[PDB]
From a paper:
The fluorescence polarization assay showed that RF is a weak binder to MR1 with an IC50 value of ∼182 µM, consistent with the previous finding that RF can stabilize MR1 on the cell surface of APCs. In the crystal structure of MR1-RF, RF did not form a Schiff base with MR1-Lys43; yet the 4-carbonyl and 5-nitrogen in the flavin (isoalloxazine) ring formed H-bonds with Lys43. The 2-carbonyl and 3-nitrogen groups of the RF ring formed H-bonds with MR1-Arg9 and Ser24, respectively. The ribityl moiety formed H-bonds with MR1-Arg9, Arg94, Tyr152, and Gln153, in addition to van der Waals (VDW) interaction with MR1-Trp156. The positioning of the ribityl tail is governed by a network of intramolecular and intermolecular polar contacts. The intramolecular interaction is formed between the 3′-OH group and the isoalloxazine ring. In addition, Tyr152 and Gln153 of MR1 formed hydrogen bonds with the 5′-OH group. RF adopted a very similar orientation to the potent MAIT activator 5-OP-RU in the MR1 pocket, leading to the same positioning of the residues in the cleft except for a slight shift in Tyr62 orientation toward the periphery of the pocket to accommodate RF. Furthermore, despite having a ribityl tail and acquiring the same orientation as 5-OP-RU in the MR1 pocket, RF fails to activate MAIT cells, likely for similar reasons. Thus, we consider that RF itself, although capable of binding MR1 in a manner that supports surface exchange and crystallization of recombinant protein, likely does not bind ER-resident MR1 to induce ER retention.
Residue numbers in the entry:
A (entry chain A): 0 to 189, 196 to 270
B (entry chain B): 0 to 97
C (entry chain G): 1 to 200
D (entry chain H): 1 to 245
Amino acid sequence: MRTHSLRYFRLGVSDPIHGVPEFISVGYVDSHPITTYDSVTRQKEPRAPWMAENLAPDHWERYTQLLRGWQQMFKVELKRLQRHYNHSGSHTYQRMIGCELLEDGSTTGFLQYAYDGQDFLIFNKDTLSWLAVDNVAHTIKQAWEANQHELLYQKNWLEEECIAWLKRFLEYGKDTLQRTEPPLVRVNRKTALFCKAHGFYPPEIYMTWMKNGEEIVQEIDYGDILPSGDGTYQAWASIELDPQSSNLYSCHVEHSGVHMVLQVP
Amino acid sequence: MIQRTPKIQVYSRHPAENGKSNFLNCYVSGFHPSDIEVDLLKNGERIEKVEHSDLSFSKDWSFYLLYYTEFTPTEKDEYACRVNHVTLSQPKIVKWDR
Amino acid sequence: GQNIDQPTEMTATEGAIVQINCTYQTSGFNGLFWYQQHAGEAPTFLSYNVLDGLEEKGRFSSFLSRSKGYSYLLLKELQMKDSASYLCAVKDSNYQLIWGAGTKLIIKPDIQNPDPAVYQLRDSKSSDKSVCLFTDFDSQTNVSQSKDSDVYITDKCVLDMRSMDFKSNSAVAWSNKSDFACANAFNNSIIPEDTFFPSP
Amino acid sequence: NAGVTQTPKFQVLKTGQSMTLQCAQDMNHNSMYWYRQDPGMGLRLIYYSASEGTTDKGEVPNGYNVSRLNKREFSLRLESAAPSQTSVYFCASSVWTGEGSGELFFGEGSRLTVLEDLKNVFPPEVAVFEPSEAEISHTQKATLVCLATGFYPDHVELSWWVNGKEVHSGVCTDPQPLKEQPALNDSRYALSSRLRVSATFWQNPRNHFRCQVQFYGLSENDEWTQDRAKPVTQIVSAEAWGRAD
Ligand SMILES: Cc1cc2nc3c(=O)[nH]c(=O)nc-3n(C[C@H](O)[C@H](O)[C@H](O)CO)c2cc1C
Ligand SMILES: [Cl-]
Ligand code: NA
């Protein structure tokens, strides 16, 4: 298979605007949302049909209870942070935990926190320690590292549980996650040459411009990989033309183990 | 506190062809914090029936969202995306360049 | 199905070592707990393992093998106060605890100077019962229940006279029958040949 | 710093009667639990409360309901008690749930016995038997025996009291009661205890020995229609004085 990943995020907001949830948690497999929970609905719900169709109601009931607890814990943790930063107003707290199963069968696992959108604490599951970016984080690092058993627990979760669940979800969603829709690629002039691709899945794609068989990495404008709305993606890359010399330009696209070259006449 | 301003990209689902139904997309990404206002405009006027994905989370802690509406492009009709964020003193308009 | 298995009961000798095994088959794994529960008391936490290996905590060590789905609780230098039930529990993929049924650990005291005897206690003026005490025998002796439905025999009990650093086993037998006598109260038990029977 | 405090320690119930068990923790824990413990099986979760303001069923919720009244308290309700709910109930708490290594902290347990009728509830008869003179001369020690007999259900606490103070050294009480008629499901119970002292201690004529059995039985609200005395919660004791002879 291609590389796949499972990730769960949490967002906490300390003084949210009216209606906006103080707490949101969403899971993803690759780029696909699979689950959602927030402090308004108080329910964990599927966000992909292949998730809903394979997990019975008692599953959603169980994790609804767990997320209600995680929500309270996140509030307490954010209250502690903003008090120790001595910050007024509304601030954000974020968590991301997840794992990857790479093509060669190796795995990775990660867990980190952010305050106001900046790295706050980063777990190292090999040295079993927390990296702290400032002295507020340093205080939390010491409290968490004093609980050695919970660091061992997270290492096991990242390396064993997370990968087991990812494989389970990959099979649930295999029709979606393991498919391939090759790109449709074209060039036009706008003076710069624009190489454009659309209709492809998975979103991972590499487009670049070659001049006379040499890759001019610093002379290329790489567009973002963007969702088209229908489950497929689009992207582009442009290079500028030298009107003082003749050169052979070619757009190169790699997607899901297939390479394409479009030579510009 | 570092706040990140939204990147705003306006594009059709398929390569646009006048008289052929399509979807106009506004992809807003890289912003922080998460509160944001997004409208699609037709000729300067807000389109009513406009859908959007749920708030989404990036690994670098910023957020992103896709706003879209079904439409049929013509030669004369101009489209744009209007976005307000705490990082923007006034709303920013990004026209659809075809 | 998910299940967890541990032996129902184990008996070891004071001062020795005992290993209590626990095997589990679960929907995922987030750690294995051992708890101690003295008779008629609350379970109390002893240990947690989640990666492979052995952790020591005083006289107790806990071992885990995830690939074998196996743990043991190791108790060294056994003392009488270690007599208790030991509960194994696994937290599964959904963070739910699956509890083993418990291992009752029985500790045999080391009886320094056995002096087996059956004594007739004095009658109470408020009771029709005659009461016999089998005491001071070594811990290898087993006390059998009564075969006469009107004779009651309790199991051996270890008492600790702490000032004298002295422990002793005893069992009690009583009845209100006219033919009941301490000389025959424990006839259904295998008792030491040299058990002392004071004259009536 | 009380930990987990649950009540009552003991309760007899008639089929169909309601009962609320209380539980409170003062450890500022977020998660609370109600378990039942029965012979031959592991603890079974009845209901739990992952956080203040939420509860959900465990493995055996039928016949029960709970109230997470606040962060500290988690009550368990038996609205219509059934014989199958005869069990020992444990309340527990943990700092959080949905984490790996955090342990449970347990309350002391509540022993419930549900009966079709209270006609077979009896307090213990308590008798104390003085040491054998043969034991005293052979060992220089003296063993008193206490017998608590004919009680039902097995809701008793036996203690020894020497010169008006409870003692534990030199005491051994059977961990489990004996069934006086082992073949009956409603058999009454017997319990024996020993207190062993030095012969010198026994031979001081002013030393006083008391065996006390607290029995948990009926209360004022329980209906009683039998000819014998209502078997209410009560203390039954018997005594002995040291003998100089
Ligand atoms: C089936 C399943 C669902 C989970 N759902 C969430 C979730 O909604 N949000 C989250 O932050 N972690 C979730 N987790 C991940 C993990 O249990 C949690 O982040 C712990 O805090 C990781 O130590 C889930 C785990 C499993 C096995
Ligand atoms: Cl993929
Ligand atoms: Na119920």
